[PDB]
Amino acid sequence: SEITLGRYLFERLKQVEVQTIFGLPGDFNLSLLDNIYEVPGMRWAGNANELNAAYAADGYARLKGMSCIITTFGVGELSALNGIAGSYAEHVGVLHVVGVPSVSSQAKQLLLHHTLGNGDFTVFHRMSSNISETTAMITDINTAPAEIDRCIRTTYVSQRPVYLGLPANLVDLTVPASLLDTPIDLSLKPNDPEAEEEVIENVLQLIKEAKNPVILADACCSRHDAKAETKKLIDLTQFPAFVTPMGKGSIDEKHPRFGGVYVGTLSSPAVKEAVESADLVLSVGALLSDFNTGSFSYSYKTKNIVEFHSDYTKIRSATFPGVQMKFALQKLLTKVADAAKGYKPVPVPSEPEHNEAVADSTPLKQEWVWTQVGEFLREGDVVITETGTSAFGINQTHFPNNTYGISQVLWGSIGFTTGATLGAAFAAEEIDPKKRVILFIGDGSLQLTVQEISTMIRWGLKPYLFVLNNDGYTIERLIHGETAQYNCIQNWQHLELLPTFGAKDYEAVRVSTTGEWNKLTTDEKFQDNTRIRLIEVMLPTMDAPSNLVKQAQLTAATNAKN
Amino acid sequence: SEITLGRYLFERLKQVEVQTIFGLPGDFNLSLLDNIYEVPGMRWAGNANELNAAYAADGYARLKGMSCIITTFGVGELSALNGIAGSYAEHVGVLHVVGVPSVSSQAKQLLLHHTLGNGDFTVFHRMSSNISETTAMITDINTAPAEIDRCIRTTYVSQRPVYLGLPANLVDLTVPASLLDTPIDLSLKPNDPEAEEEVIENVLQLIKEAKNPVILADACCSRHDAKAETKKLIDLTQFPAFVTPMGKGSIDEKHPRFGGVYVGTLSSPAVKEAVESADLVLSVGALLSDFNTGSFSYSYKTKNIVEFHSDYTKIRSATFPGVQMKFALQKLLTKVADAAKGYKPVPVPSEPEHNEAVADSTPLKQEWVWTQVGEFLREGDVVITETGTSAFGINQTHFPNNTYGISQVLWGSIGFTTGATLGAAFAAEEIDPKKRVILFIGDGSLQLTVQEISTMIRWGLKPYLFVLNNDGYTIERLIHGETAQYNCIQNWQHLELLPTFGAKDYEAVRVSTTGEWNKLTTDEKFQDNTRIRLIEVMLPTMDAPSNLVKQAQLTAATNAKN
């Protein structure tokens, strides 16, 4: 019993729970794609372009664990590249498979379409190696199952993009089916016993001594799977728990000990103080980007900083190479309650609010929206926020427990979120058909990736697409050129996007007032994810969350340098 | 008197006749873009995404001589790379300007947005250099004016994309205005007199001996500026003249000595016979790609092949390095009427210029449409055909003299032409507003880049957008997977796209029959470019011009072979 190499690929992906495959067809991958239909459960999204396909592979991997996008040599791959880079930047495990010209076309340097016309078949592979954890350009059938397994493990474990090139002529060759009976090894190796035990004792002593210890969960807590441990640590220690913007959603915001979003100097006065006064910081998965830290504005001076990281740990000035956080946290948690039993709980900053009631005629403002969105959310929602006012405003929104956030704070590619939403809707559907996928995207960002709405429609996916109509690039207007033509956009009939892409069962509604907002969002039928929905949210052109106004200025200054 | 470095950039582009600037803003390019408005006549397009911007810059340069897309560090520039790669593949001089972090941001390796989180500011520049003729990352103001000139010259002269990175802090520093008073050198080095003389004596001698000489114009005749020389060569020799698919438009098809489109084995029998029985082939600008040549199908029955190229000449088995075609043809022209004086003109092929009468109710078919296109075209038209049935079908359309064709036969990135259309239409409006820009794009291709229609509306541009609705990817269906779900697309309402993107003054009409076709296209008001039009052409799913049917099969077999 034998299967095609293409077949093997799809069977392996299914074993790591990839059910939906992203990308676009081309002659160089059509035989490969045939195999998808031979694997029970697997489907082909049918994306509207390769850039959006890669954004969607990203959103899907964030929920599902990993994902796979297939493109065609040259023109498919190169289109995906900004999607792949972003997955790299943000530690998202995306397997990028490219259908390439058969080996005999390559050997004989055929002047083929999608080449640069110089007979170099290695160029695109070479470009992609710059943004991949590892790569394979498969030429040898005898090692190919092993290479694919290597690419999958690396994608899954490292959580970085991997590039797999497959000649069209290789994909139809057979491999023994029994190769599939043995699972890919998807584990990490255990820590060094001595190194890890020294980390533990060290952290344990620091905790025993600390009067005002605080926990801070950042991006890599989320990206590298330490969420269950960080949750236990908060429960067992009762230390105040804070979250960065890039880690929003990785810790539960309705826990009695949750103190807020810390963004250095842009934090609320109570959060800034509760954090910066700590005599011990337990940091989980720091990723200190400009926007994630209010332009590098942390101010603690203390030490007793413990940094947990995927592959090492830092304690004060010391680094412990190879001490991986997931196992180190697991081991820590068996002794942490005793270490902390002398801790008298310091009070945490109290949550923001509810908006006060206002006249129903009151026009919508950014500040009011971000607070209100908290009344709409429920446990288990996926909340996706575009770079722009949306990404900044969500910080102030209070998540129910078990809310999965998606915000590309480091890469910051506008338009990402239309595709991330498609891929998240696919993932959610396979996880739990009642989990809601809720997108906030600006009117400008939508334009770059709008066609991926079509793919959501063709699969009957049912996300909520909040479109923030503020007449252009408000985030950019706040940085430079408040009235510059380059910050304006052609205005679109947003309510027409859905039926134009062929939707038949949908809602498209415009909200301009608090009354319209509330009427829509408190409606029981609206709250159920029974159809795709677009909500055009009319806002003032220069209205922004206060943190964005501050940041816009910090950023402007940085660039103009001297 | 001093101007900003940014200003200097734009005054330079104005001197090589770039009036429209493509791309998207981003914080690292905003200061740069301010200067556009400081230079009389220069405009910023405001594209809907960077890939589309890059496609539009390509279309722009094909018409104008060169173009400029400006993007932002990481996220803009990576999004544009497929467009740039296409420009490199097809020899189009696009200058790619990237606004990048200030010099000391890079020096201090700040964890900024749009980086890979690893401190490497060189990686995107390194990626672009694989698909660039040269690059510049500007760091020094004293040398920036010269580096910019070096870039523009290379772009213009080599007709390939150039990469130019401008740190955000440098673009406001100033340079002497007087610099602009010395022209960039835009000229070619001349040929070696001795090597050129050998070439010419050789060709002349062959011409004197030929009874059946023929001329074959190909892609590099247009890309490398030899169309004037080639027209004169046809005039003075009276030899039969043929064009390849990729060079279509580069020679006048209503010339009495025009013999048709040669595509090796995919040629009409009269054309294959006319060319292959030749006893001399004067080949101008050969680019022998799969789709250009019926899968490398040429069967010249002579050894007397002369290949002119930008940088060398070939005669029979001999290569003449450095013998440049523009110059060698100019020299050839001075003696060639005399070498050819004893030539008795052999008759040239044709096909019917016209379709048979049919019932007006006749469903539209590809073969009928492509012949019928010829009755609608006028001299001065720009004819843009997408990869798919459009690009193969146009080969059977008869051009009026002075028809400019754009068909990306080598690179073959679907979606290209929506962008190329925007940029051809800008260019054409600057050249002569009476020049119509006429697009043929499939339902599938349109999906990848549809948002760029928005940018046409914004600027009041008046292309004719013929959209071929055959319910999916017909060209792929003929390659493999006739009814595969991967060759199927979500169905759009093409008639609604234009209002949806804010069009006020426009037409959108569906045509299904020959009579609806004739009614619309023979209408005098329709034939005037006074508004943006979309024509939705309804065609059968498996309907294809017969050339594409054969080519799909060869390609299939090329991809399968071991």
Ligand SMILES: Cc1ncc(C[n+]2csc(CCOP(=O)(O)OP(=O)(O)O)c2C)c(N)n1
């Ligand atoms: C791919 C890409 N191109 C350009 C940019 C630069 N950029 C950052 S924010 C922004 C504008 C966002 O506009 P919108 O989505 O309308 O957000 P809001 O008006 O709510 O601020 C742009 C163009 C980017 N981040 N990514």
Ligand SMILES: Cc1ncc(C[n+]2csc(CCOP(=O)(O)OP(=O)(O)O)c2C)c(N)n1
């Ligand atoms: C960016 C990109 N992705 C994938 C391909 C592979 N490809 C070539 S033709 C084609 C289908 C185009 O279909 P359509 O425009 O509807 O043309 P038609 O049906 O008239 O043949 C595809 C997906 C490509 N050339 N470029």
Ligand SMILES: *[C@@](C)(O)P(=O)(O)OC
């Ligand atoms: C994250 C950047 O903190 P990590 O170090 O865990 O990621 C690899």
Ligand SMILES: *[C@@](C)(O)P(=O)(O)OC
């Ligand atoms: C064209 C491919 O013939 P060229 O040789 O002029 O290109 C540089």
Ligand SMILES: COP(=O)(O)C(C)=O
């Ligand atoms: C988070 O990853 P999973 O274990 O869910 C998987 C095997 O995909």
Ligand SMILES: COP(=O)(O)C(C)=O
């Ligand atoms: C100097 O302008 P050019 O002639 O170079 C042009 C046609 O762009």
Ligand SMILES: COP(=O)(O)[C@H](C)O
């Ligand atoms: C080239 O073959 P194909 O995959 O049909 C598309 C043109 O790329």
Ligand SMILES: COP(=O)(O)[C@H](C)O
């Ligand atoms: C980050 O700066 P910006 O240019 O506004 C966009 C997010 O890049």
Ligand SMILES: [Mg+2]
């Ligand atoms: Mg906006």
Ligand SMILES: [Mg+2]
């Ligand atoms: Mg089609």
